[PDB]
Design a protein around this ligand. Sequence first.
Ligand SMILES: *[C@@H]1O[C@H](CO[C@@H]2O[C@@H](C)[C@@H](O)[C@@H](O)[C@@H]2O)[C@@H](O[C@@H]2O[C@H](CO)[C@@H](O[C@@H]3O[C@H](CO)[C@@H](O)[C@H](O[C@H]4O[C@H](CO)[C@@H](O)[C@H](O)[C@@H]4O)[C@@H]3O)[C@H](O)[C@H]2NC(C)=O)[C@H](O)[C@H]1NC(C)=O
Ligand SMILES: *[C@@H]1O[C@H](CO[C@@H]2O[C@@H](C)[C@@H](O)[C@@H](O)[C@@H]2O)[C@@H](O[C@@H]2O[C@H](CO)[C@@H](O[C@@H]3O[C@H](CO)[C@@H](O)[C@H](O)[C@@H]3O)[C@H](O)[C@H]2NC(C)=O)[C@H](O)[C@H]1NC(C)=O
Ligand SMILES: *[C@@H]1O[C@H](CO[C@@H]2O[C@@H](C)[C@@H](O)[C@@H](O)[C@@H]2O)[C@@H](O[C@@H]2O[C@H](CO)[C@@H](O)[C@H](O)[C@H]2NC(C)=O)[C@H](O)[C@H]1NC(C)=O
Ligand SMILES: *[C@@H]1O[C@H](CO[C@@H]2O[C@@H](C)[C@@H](O)[C@@H](O)[C@@H]2O)[C@@H](O[C@@H]2O[C@H](CO)[C@@H](O)[C@H](O)[C@H]2NC(C)=O)[C@H](O)[C@H]1NC(C)=O
Ligand SMILES: *[C@@H]1O[C@H](CO[C@@H]2O[C@@H](C)[C@@H](O)[C@@H](O)[C@@H]2O)[C@@H](O[C@@H]2O[C@H](CO)[C@@H](O)[C@H](O)[C@H]2NC(C)=O)[C@H](O)[C@H]1NC(C)=O
Ligand SMILES: *[C@@H]1O[C@H](CO[C@@H]2O[C@@H](C)[C@@H](O)[C@@H](O)[C@@H]2O)[C@@H](O)[C@H](O)[C@H]1NC(C)=O
Lengths: 220, 295
Amino acid sequence: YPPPVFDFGMPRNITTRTGHTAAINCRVDNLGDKSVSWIRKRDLHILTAGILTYTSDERFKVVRTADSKDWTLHVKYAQPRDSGIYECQVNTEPKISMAFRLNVIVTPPDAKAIIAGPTDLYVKVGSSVTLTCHVKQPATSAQDIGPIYWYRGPYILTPFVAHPNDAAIDLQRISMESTLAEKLQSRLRIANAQLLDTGNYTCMPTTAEAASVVVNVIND
Amino acid sequence: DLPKFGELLQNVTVPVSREAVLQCVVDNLQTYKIAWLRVDTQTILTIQNHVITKNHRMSITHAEKRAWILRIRDVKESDKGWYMCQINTDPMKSQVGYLDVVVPPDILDYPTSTDMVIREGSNVTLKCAATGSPTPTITWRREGGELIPLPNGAEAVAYNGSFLTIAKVNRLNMGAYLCIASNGIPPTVSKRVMLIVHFPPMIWIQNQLVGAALTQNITLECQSEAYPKSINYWMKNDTIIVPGERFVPETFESGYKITMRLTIYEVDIQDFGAYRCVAKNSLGDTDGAIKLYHI
Ligand SMILES: *[C@@H]1O[C@H](CO[C@@H]2O[C@@H](C)[C@@H](O)[C@@H](O)[C@@H]2O)[C@@H](O[C@@H]2O[C@H](CO)[C@@H](O[C@@H]3O[C@H](CO)[C@@H](O)[C@H](O[C@H]4O[C@H](CO)[C@@H](O)[C@H](O)[C@@H]4O)[C@@H]3O)[C@H](O)[C@H]2NC(C)=O)[C@H](O)[C@H]1NC(C)=O
Ligand SMILES: *[C@@H]1O[C@H](CO[C@@H]2O[C@@H](C)[C@@H](O)[C@@H](O)[C@@H]2O)[C@@H](O[C@@H]2O[C@H](CO)[C@@H](O[C@@H]3O[C@H](CO)[C@@H](O)[C@H](O)[C@@H]3O)[C@H](O)[C@H]2NC(C)=O)[C@H](O)[C@H]1NC(C)=O
Ligand SMILES: *[C@@H]1O[C@H](CO[C@@H]2O[C@@H](C)[C@@H](O)[C@@H](O)[C@@H]2O)[C@@H](O[C@@H]2O[C@H](CO)[C@@H](O)[C@H](O)[C@H]2NC(C)=O)[C@H](O)[C@H]1NC(C)=O
Ligand SMILES: *[C@@H]1O[C@H](CO[C@@H]2O[C@@H](C)[C@@H](O)[C@@H](O)[C@@H]2O)[C@@H](O[C@@H]2O[C@H](CO)[C@@H](O)[C@H](O)[C@H]2NC(C)=O)[C@H](O)[C@H]1NC(C)=O
Ligand SMILES: *[C@@H]1O[C@H](CO[C@@H]2O[C@@H](C)[C@@H](O)[C@@H](O)[C@@H]2O)[C@@H](O[C@@H]2O[C@H](CO)[C@@H](O)[C@H](O)[C@H]2NC(C)=O)[C@H](O)[C@H]1NC(C)=O
Ligand SMILES: *[C@@H]1O[C@H](CO[C@@H]2O[C@@H](C)[C@@H](O)[C@@H](O)[C@@H]2O)[C@@H](O)[C@H](O)[C@H]1NC(C)=O
């Protein structure tokens, strides 16, 4: 028989942005009938034993794959106080264990793109459409300003960025303007709307989470 | 109104190969869950009534409502250490207690000193290593209760320490020493260590002047100290003296002491003169004169 053994190639330094769900994946081969436990080394707080959750902090849960090879510890709404060493533990005797380090960073602050207006627009053929996107972020912006791109579905619209892109969309009717007037902003205009312009337009920043509007061009 | 610990995690002492029984008391547990675990290795032991460890020697029982009892059958010394009781409150609560596993002491052959052979006036160090739980204190004694030369220039009938260093060893220091290991857990064990002191011979003579008359039987006698044991013979006119039907030399040996006699039967006018008793061993020789004269 083969004793359970860890896959020591799994990432051992998880880094999560505060507010996001942190995930520490632990893979054990040849588990057999042995269980995997997640424990906090700092104070010995048992987090999960098998699929049973022991801790009462609602943000901690363990998930295993169907084949029980991959055990993952999820920390919802991670906060810096969660940074530390967590031990993946198999109940052999003696017990084996691997140690992962969670580092919950806080810089930069949460940034989220917003597109003023309803989420699903409906415009007639020949009409014009304008989508105004801006990044909601704390006061401190400083030198953390990056380009903002647009997409219709999976196809980027910003010219001279994706090279080569054989799926480039004709920009004769579509213009984009990115200005930084205190607040980082980007405006997309479609002139003379056409049925083929219908799609899921996405405002894709490089310093903030993306947002999207669905644009529907219709007849009449 | 969260769960509370009814009392400390009681310390438990247990001799090897018996059953350890740690007990954790929780009041108002409610829907919360109690968990045992070993602290040094951070090993989850049990949660509620389930045993997480595959260690067949551990079990958990919950007869009384407030007492969760962890049982370790056939304990080993490797089970000695801190154990923890944990409640999955928020924040989590935990208390710890110690499981002490006592082992009667034992003296290791190494590095415990074997027999020692030292020249008189030189250093020697007797070592002795023992294993136990608690760790045994080592005590040195001598057979018969003789004094042990202490490092601080003094002397005493016992010395505590794993190594006993003697500077300037004396023939009186020679004999059997005892390494005695004890730790409160019977039985106490001990190991004998021989300290052997070698030195050249010395001779003492009670009567360096003895007289007699013809036909008389007189006996001359010397005393020597020498170790290793010395060969002792008599001389006269610089000539050895063999048992010759009239002269009969003897030796009475006891340790490093020797009493040598020369019994002369039927004294003759030619016997009178200067005798010599001699003692010789590896480290040197010595002698002493006895004059036999006429009445
Ligand atoms: C319109 O288009 C945007 C852009 O996404 C596009 O995806 C590709 C197809 C390609 O075209 C890209 O160029 C383009 O960016 C769509 O936005 C995505 O929407 C999904 C929602 O289904 C998001 O998925 C979520 O991601 C979160 C990241 O933290 C994650 O937490 C979420 O997990 C939760 O929800 C899932 C179910 O969705 C659940 O399984 C989990 O357990 C958990 O609860 C979730 O995975 C993407 O992040 C969005 N991507 C971007 C870039 O914004 C948009 O959906 C699409 N259509 C509409 C109607 O808006
Ligand atoms: C519960 O038991 C632990 C462990 O003690 C061990 O088990 C007991 C059942 C007895 O058999 C003991 O003889 C045995 O050693 C106790 O912890 C021990 O406490 C003492 C005193 O606080 C510690 O001594 C200290 O040692 C440090 C380090 O040098 C010094 O700085 C201190 O000044 C002091 O001397 C001892 O280290 C510690 N043992 C361990 C393993 O850490 C504990 O007190 C006891 N609790 C009770 C009875 O309530
Ligand atoms: C994993 O991280 C440790 C600790 O480094 C910290 O954590 C990182 C994740 C990062 O986010 C920063 O907070 C720190 O760098 C690494 O161990 C360190 O290694 C450096 C040299 O590379 C050494 O100078 C430090 O003393 C180490 N610190 C400790 C606590 O040991 C480790 O190398 C990282 N491993 C991987 C695979 O990235
Ligand atoms: C040699 O040591 C023993 C052991 O006693 C020590 O006492 C502790 C303070 C600590 O030093 C531990 O290592 C030992 O337990 C001595 O025996 C003790 O004597 C005292 C009186 O002085 C008595 O109260 C204790 O009960 C004794 N210990 C035991 C276990 O019974 C002994 O006196 C020492 N002898 C020499 C010559 O140093
Ligand atoms: C002096 O010694 C002689 C010889 O006897 C010695 O002692 C014996 C025990 C034995 O060891 C012999 O080999 C020794 O030579 C003594 O003579 C003897 O005396 C006893 C008692 O008087 C007598 O019974 C024996 O027959 C004697 N034998 C001989 C051969 O003489 C003698 O008495 C001693 N002198 C004195 C004063 O004691
Ligand atoms: C013999 O030992 C001499 C010193 O005796 C010891 O010194 C102190 C530090 C303690 O060990 C104590 O037990 C004794 O008083 C040395 O000066 C000398 O060099 C040594 N010589 C030999 C040959 O061992």
